[PDB]
Amino acid sequence: QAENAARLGRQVLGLLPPPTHRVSLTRGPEFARGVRDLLSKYAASTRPTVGSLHEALRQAPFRQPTYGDFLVYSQTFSPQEPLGTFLFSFKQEDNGSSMDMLLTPTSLFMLSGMEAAKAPQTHKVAGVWYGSGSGLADFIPNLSELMDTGEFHTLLTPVGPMVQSVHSTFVTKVTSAMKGVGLARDEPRAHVGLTLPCDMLVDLDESCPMREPAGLNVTIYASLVYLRVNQRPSMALTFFQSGKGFAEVVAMIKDHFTDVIRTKYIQLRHELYINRLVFGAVCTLGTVPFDSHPVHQSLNSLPVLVFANFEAACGPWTVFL
Amino acid sequence: IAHGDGRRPNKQRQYIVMKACNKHHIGAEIELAAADIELLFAEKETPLD
Amino acid sequence: FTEYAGAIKTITSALQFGMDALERGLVDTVLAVKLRHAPPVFILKTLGD
Amino acid sequence: ALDKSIVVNLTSRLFADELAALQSKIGSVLPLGDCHRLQNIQALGLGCVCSRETSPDYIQIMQYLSKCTLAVLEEVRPDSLRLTRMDPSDNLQIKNVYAPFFQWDSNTQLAVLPPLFSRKDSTIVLESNGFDIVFPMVVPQQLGHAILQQLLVYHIYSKISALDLYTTNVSFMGRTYRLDVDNTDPRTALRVLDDLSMYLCILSALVPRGCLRLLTALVRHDRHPLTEVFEGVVPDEVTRIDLDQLSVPDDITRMRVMFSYLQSLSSIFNLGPRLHVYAYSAETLAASCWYSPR
């Protein structure tokens, strides 16, 4: 039975942070032999083999993300998910000991209440994960007034993708990911990527070409737009995929939402409320490495993109207009 | 091939090709005369049979 | 064991691919050196006389 | 761990003329297009967007500069250029040979700008290969802003003309300089001005009334060192808006929106990728810094 305990002697002492490089001076120049991962040009031969390069593969960078542990009502977080969705932590007031509220982008489409033609795919899918929209509106009574003065983009803190979720009847545990690549729980040695519905994502770089430079980086941006439909305030969340840098995309997002700016601001020739002037916000959901192909999927149908090698790095909310 | 111009390198590439078996069916009829079958199974007991 | 030893086969066949995509680099560039210094017949022939 | 090295193949032996300028700038930052070891020379220059016969537009060139990766030279061999790479976030040596010289120190901040003073000085042409190479300029962040401040003002006052001492001169403590404007395409420098007309007239609608009444109490008698812009006379407009009575909870809703739109003016006055220098040697002209992400 100690052979099972001898396994934890191997794995725990094998998996540690690397210790500090500290060698006493009386030993001499032995410390230069203790520097291996800074060496990055390994010698090759006529016929190289793994036994020639098993030392070369042994140095690897130090990557460990920081997880988030959320305790959620089983009503808000729909019990079946594709295990890689994006999340949000909505926060109003600590009323309970530990109860937390989490919003998938299919769920935030239900609290929005926009027309069907803006997102013609997810409206059927998000209509069967939930009720008619009052199952989630009972928890936030201020959804009329949080849209008027425009405080809703100040109450969302972007979290990242899922990792694990153990589901019970009343209480659902959600294990999320921050800082980067979350380790997959059920499949060993796998990595959970970030999945978006194809309807919500709006690509930005698209050309005939009719040339743009390459890079290492492309940054997914979140967006959230205050608007009015049926003379009732409602929100609209879209995503962006671009590597243009922050100085361009703010001008590019204005060209996407041109009509939404125009149809709203016809109203304020009559009534000019300073609380109404706030329009939208843009966060930074973290970087994606270049030339990774987003792979289409199909779920139930619902087409869902996927991003391998996603890493998360949350940012502030800045008010664009 | 590794190039010296530089356009982008080319990673390792493989292919997995599916094949299958075509089956076939074959038939050819054999007629027998009902008069010829009838005299076969009875016992011969005369020099004519 | 057969997952381990089936993983050491992949990485060698990725790395035998590494050297033998560079031996094509010789046969490319040496042939590319010749063609930079190879004028055609009709230019060089009357200069031969 | 990670390696960083770009060695550039080149199809012709360089002359001793053009090698002497490249030997002069052995520590320098130039952007390039792709992320590989081997690379053609047609990506090394910044001049794929800024050529001679093409009229350059320095906003679009600066817009170009945030996309690309940045690289530092190591050696100049007479056939192959050899460079090292900059990735966020990595500490690295940087050495300023940049010709309109400014002085740095430890704990300073930087930025990368297109050449805005002397193109002929800061670009060398390669007659052997026929393709020219354009070097950007590294600037501390105060003058990194203050040159872009003047160039936005300039395209405002060239359109009204459809003289030069007020529009083309970037001011700084101790020195004045000349911007290089002979051929500028204003159309990418005017879309930035098109968004400035959006933000600035919204900020003229939600103006706090008490902070207008503060200047009516200030600039008439109370003269301060940094209020010499008004020269002692109130503008005619400010007397018109202050007819209403003051109340606190009007301005509480206003000043938060005044606050929230000045968050947006980061996005229109952005520089390139920034460089936070922690240690700078003086007599060696070397430095050390970590490259920031865009």
Side-chain angles (χ1 to χ4, degrees):
Chain A
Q1 63 184 356
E3 297 293 326
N4 196 6
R7 294 183 184 275
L8 275 77
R10 296 289 188 270
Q11 293 179 356
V12 175
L13 276 77
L15 183 63
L16 289 175
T20 63
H21 190 196
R22 186 179 294 114
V23 175
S24 64
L25 191 145
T26 63
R27 185 176 291 174
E30 183 66 28
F31 63 96
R33 292 180 179 90
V35 179
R36 297 294 178 90
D37 56 353
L38 275 74
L39 191 145
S40 179
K41 290 181 181 178
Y42 295 99
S45 66
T46 300
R47 187 179 293 113
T49 321
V50 178
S52 67
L53 295 179
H54 67 277
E55 191 273 335
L57 298 165
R58 188 170 179 83
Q59 303 300 319
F62 182 72
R63 297 289 186 268
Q64 186 173 4
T66 59
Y67 292 147
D69 292 333
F70 292 155
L71 192 144
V72 192
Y73 289 100
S74 66
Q75 182 180 1
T76 62
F77 186 78
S78 65
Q80 294 183 355
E81 288 295 326
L83 196 64
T85 59
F86 190 71
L87 281 77
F88 291 104
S89 291
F90 182 73
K91 180 69 192 300
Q92 186 61 254
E93 179 174 0
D94 283 331
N95 197 9
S97 64
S98 179
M99 298 307 297
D100 201 3
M101 189 182 291
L102 271 63
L103 296 175
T104 63
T106 64
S107 301
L108 189 60
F109 181 75
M110 293 301 291
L111 277 77
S112 68
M114 70 183 80
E115 293 294 328
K118 300 294 182 292
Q121 183 63 44
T122 61
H123 192 200
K124 182 178 177 181
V125 179
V128 83
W129 293 115
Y130 299 99
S132 67
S134 66
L136 294 177
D138 291 333
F139 287 163
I140 306 100
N142 291 319
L143 287 176
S144 65
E145 292 181 354
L146 288 175
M147 296 302 297
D148 289 332
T149 63
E151 292 180 354
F152 188 79
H153 67 276
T154 62
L155 297 177
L156 292 178
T157 61
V159 179
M162 281 171 65
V163 171
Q164 191 183 7
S165 293
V166 176
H167 181 75
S168 296
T169 302
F170 292 99
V171 174
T172 302
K173 179 67 173 64
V174 173
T175 302
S176 64
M178 295 178 184
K179 281 185 179 177
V181 182
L183 182 62
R185 293 286 191 271
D186 295 332
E187 292 180 354
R189 303 291 186 268
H191 296 287
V192 173
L194 175 137
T195 70
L196 302 179
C198 298
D199 200 356
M200 292 297 171
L201 188 143
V202 174
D203 197 4
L204 191 62
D205 48 349
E206 181 68 33
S207 296
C208 295
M210 192 72 202
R211 182 180 174 180
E212 291 184 354
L216 189 65
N217 190 357
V218 49
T219 60
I220 288 175
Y221 289 161
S223 68
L224 191 145
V225 171
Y226 296 153
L227 59 91
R228 293 181 69 189
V229 61
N230 294 318
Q231 293 179 355
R232 295 179 70 186
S234 69
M235 69 186 75
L237 178 138
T238 58
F239 286 148
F240 291 104
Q241 179 177 0
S242 66
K244 290 181 179 68
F246 185 70
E248 308 189 9
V249 181
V250 178
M252 291 299 291
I253 288 171
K254 291 181 183 181
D255 290 332
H256 187 199
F257 292 100
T258 298
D259 296 333
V260 182
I261 293 168
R262 288 177 63 90
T263 55
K264 178 187 281 185
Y265 288 162
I266 289 172
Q267 299 302 110
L268 56 79
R269 182 63 180 87
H270 293 89
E271 68 276 18
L272 190 145
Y273 293 103
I274 303 165
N275 295 319
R276 296 293 191 274
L277 265 72
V278 61
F279 183 74
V282 168
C283 179
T284 301
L285 302 189
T287 64
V288 175
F290 186 69
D291 82 15
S292 62
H293 289 172
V295 178
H296 293 85
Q297 296 295 322
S298 296
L299 294 172
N300 52 357
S301 295
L302 181 63
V304 178
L305 290 174
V306 67
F307 290 100
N309 279 316
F310 182 78
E311 62 184 2
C314 181
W317 293 99
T318 60
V319 180
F320 73 101
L321 180 53
Chain B
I1 302 169
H3 290 90
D5 292 331
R7 53 182 298 277
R8 66 183 182 273
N10 287 314
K11 306 292 187 182
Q12 57 181 356
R13 294 189 296 268
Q14 294 180 359
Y15 289 97
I16 295 170
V17 178
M18 184 70 197
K19 292 290 176 66
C21 291
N22 289 317
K23 293 184 288 294
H24 297 286
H25 296 285
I26 277 173
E29 291 183 355
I30 295 97
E31 295 292 328
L32 295 177
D36 190 78
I37 299 169
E38 194 269 332
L39 60 94
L40 183 67
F41 62 95
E43 184 178 1
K44 74 282 191 186
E45 59 187 1
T46 189
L48 192 145
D49 292 334
Chain C
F1 288 100
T2 189
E3 180 67 30
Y4 177 78
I8 198 167
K9 288 172 67 177
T10 301
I11 184 166
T12 55
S13 66
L15 185 141
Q16 293 293 325
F17 174 75
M19 293 301 292
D20 289 332
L22 185 141
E23 294 294 326
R24 304 296 183 92
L26 289 174
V27 184
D28 192 8
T29 55
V30 173
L31 182 58
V33 164
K34 297 291 186 182
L35 294 173
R36 289 181 181 175
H37 300 284
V41 168
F42 65 93
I43 291 175
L44 188 144
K45 181 179 180 292
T46 63
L47 272 71
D49 291 333
Chain D
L2 186 64
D3 191 76
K4 50 185 186 292
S5 68
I6 299 169
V7 54
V8 176
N9 195 4
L10 180 53
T11 185
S12 69
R13 187 177 294 272
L14 295 176
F15 291 161
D17 194 5
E18 54 191 357
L19 194 146
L22 290 171
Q23 187 60 254
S24 178
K25 292 183 181 180
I26 192 66
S28 176
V29 173
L30 56 88
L32 53 91
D34 293 331
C35 299
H36 303 288
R37 181 166 177 169
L38 279 76
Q39 186 66 256
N40 289 317
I41 197 170
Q42 297 176 356
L44 269 72
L46 190 144
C48 66
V49 70
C50 183
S51 295
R52 290 180 181 175
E53 64 186 2
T54 62
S55 293
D57 41 354
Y58 294 112
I59 295 299
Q60 183 69 43
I61 296 168
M62 186 174 172
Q63 183 176 1
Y64 178 81
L65 192 144
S66 68
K67 289 182 179 179
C68 296
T69 183
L70 278 73
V72 180
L73 278 77
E74 290 182 353
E75 293 182 355
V76 180
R77 289 180 181 175
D79 292 332
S80 66
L81 290 172
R82 185 176 180 178
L83 283 78
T84 191
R85 186 181 171 88
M86 299 176 70
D87 287 329
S89 174
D90 186 76
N91 290 319
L92 54 95
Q93 293 178 358
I94 186 169
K95 185 176 180 180
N96 43 358
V97 205
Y98 293 87
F101 182 74
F102 294 102
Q103 185 63 42
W104 301 348
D105 54 350
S106 65
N107 290 317
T108 190
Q109 295 173 356
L110 295 178
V112 180
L113 293 182
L116 290 164
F117 297 105
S118 296
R119 293 179 68 190
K120 188 176 181 180
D121 195 5
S122 178
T123 63
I124 55 170
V125 64
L126 273 70
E127 295 177 353
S128 178
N129 296 112
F131 181 73
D132 51 352
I133 294 170
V134 174
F135 291 156
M137 181 180 174
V138 298
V139 180
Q141 291 186 0
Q142 184 64 43
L143 284 169
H145 294 174
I147 298 165
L148 180 141
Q149 305 302 102
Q150 189 58 255
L151 193 146
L152 291 176
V153 170
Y154 179 74
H155 291 288
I156 294 170
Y157 287 97
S158 69
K159 187 67 184 296
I160 302 172
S161 66
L163 295 174
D164 293 330
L165 292 173
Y166 289 155
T167 60
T168 61
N169 290 324
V170 175
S171 68
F172 182 66
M173 297 297 107
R175 298 291 180 90
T176 59
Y177 293 103
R178 179 73 180 176
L179 291 177
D180 192 1
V181 177
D182 50 354
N183 293 318
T184 54
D185 194 1
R187 65 180 182 178
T188 62
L190 199 148
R191 186 176 293 171
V192 175
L193 293 174
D194 283 326
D195 293 334
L196 281 171
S197 65
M198 294 172 70
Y199 289 113
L200 191 63
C201 280
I202 292 172
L203 293 177
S204 69
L206 50 95
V207 179
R209 302 296 177 91
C211 186
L212 286 178
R213 192 180 292 273
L214 188 143
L215 290 185
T216 63
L218 192 145
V219 304
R220 295 177 69 90
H221 67 286
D222 282 322
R223 291 191 295 113
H224 293 90
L226 59 90
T227 186
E228 294 178 354
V229 181
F230 294 99
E231 295 291 327
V233 178
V234 293
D236 187 74
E237 190 188 9
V238 187
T239 62
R240 297 291 184 184
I241 312 298
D242 285 328
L243 57 88
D244 290 330
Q245 295 181 358
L246 293 180
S247 66
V248 182
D250 288 331
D251 288 334
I252 300 299
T253 59
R254 290 183 182 177
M255 287 295 292
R256 292 177 65 249
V257 179
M258 180 67 75
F259 179 79
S260 65
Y261 284 155
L262 267 68
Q263 296 185 354
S264 64
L265 292 175
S266 69
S267 69
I268 193 166
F269 290 106
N270 274 318
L271 297 177
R274 294 180 188 269
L275 294 176
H276 292 170
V277 174
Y278 61 93
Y280 177 78
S281 296
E283 64 183 2
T284 317
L285 295 174
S288 64
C289 174
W290 61 274
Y291 179 76
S292 296
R294 65 182 184 270

